Amino acid sequence: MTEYKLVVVGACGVGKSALTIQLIQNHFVDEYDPTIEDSYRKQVVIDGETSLLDILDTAGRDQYMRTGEGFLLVFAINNTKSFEDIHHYREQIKRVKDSEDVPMVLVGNKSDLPSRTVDTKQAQDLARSYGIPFIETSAKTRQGVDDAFYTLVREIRKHK
Ligand SMILES: *CCC(=O)N1CCN(c2nnc(-c3ccccc3)c3cc(-c4c(O)cccc4F)c(Cl)cc23)CC1
Ligand SMILES: Nc1nc2c(ncn2[C@@H]2O[C@H](COP(=O)(O)OP(=O)(O)O)[C@@H](O)[C@H]2O)c(=O)[nH]1
Ligand SMILES: [Mg+2]
């Protein structure tokens, strides 16, 4: 039985809240208040081991981020600016965590949408350059949502 502090980061409107609420409440919330930043808790079993997840859904400071054990780097597959922002979020995290190996997962959300502007290959190549996994999600359909969070827990376990 182990605890994990997870932090969900990424540009405004990529689906941080939608992803987190899907994980916790098992339904899709359209346009969750973009200014609400809160922590959520969920107990799960991953690879046989019971895990309590403490999840911070960041919104509109260093202290909270330093206590994070792993980070979901979320962009939206129809929003190139959010994908370009990922390297900046990565840099901010490394600086506050002291540029050490920090468990992270790259998450490409909104996979249900047709107007794609970032391809999986691009995201895989970015994830490869950081030595982290890439997971594609849709908070709307729930595809990949558990995978993103569970993969992060696995990355934290490998680090610990
Ligand atoms: C629409 C409201 C929303 O969802 N917000 C979350 C994203 N917020 C935000 N914007 N910019 C930066 C940033 C990124 C790179 C360089 C400067 C500023 C944000 C950074 C962080 C952050 C910090 O400050 C430290 C460690 C890890 C981080 F992700 C956060 Cl938490 C949020 C940032 C705008 C509001
Ligand atoms: N089509 C689609 N829309 C999404 C998805 N995830 C979030 N959204 C929508 O994208 C917008 C931003 O989502 P939100 O969770 O508020 O993003 P946040 O600012 O990162 O917390 C909202 O209008 C959501 O309903 C998704 O997977 N697919
Ligand atoms: Mg939000």
Curated annotation (Swiss-Prot):
Effect noted on mutating G60R: In CFC2; characterized by a defective GTPase-activating protein sensitivity and a strongly reduced interaction with effectors
Annotated consequence of substituting Y40A? Decreased interaction with MAPKAP1/SIN1
**UniProt record, GO biological process:** actin cytoskeleton organization; cardiac muscle cell proliferation; cytokine-mediated signaling pathway; epithelial tube branching involved in lung morphogenesis; female pregnancy; forebrain astrocyte development; gene expression; glial cell proliferation
Compartments annotated for it: namely: Cell membrane; Endomembrane system; Cytoplasm, Cytosol
UniProt binding sites for GTP: 10-18, 29-35, 59-60, 109-112
Q: Which domain of life is it from?
A: Eukaryota
Residues modified to N6-acetyllysine: K97
Which positions carry N-acetylmethionine? Answer: M1
UniProt-recorded name of the protein: GTPase KRas
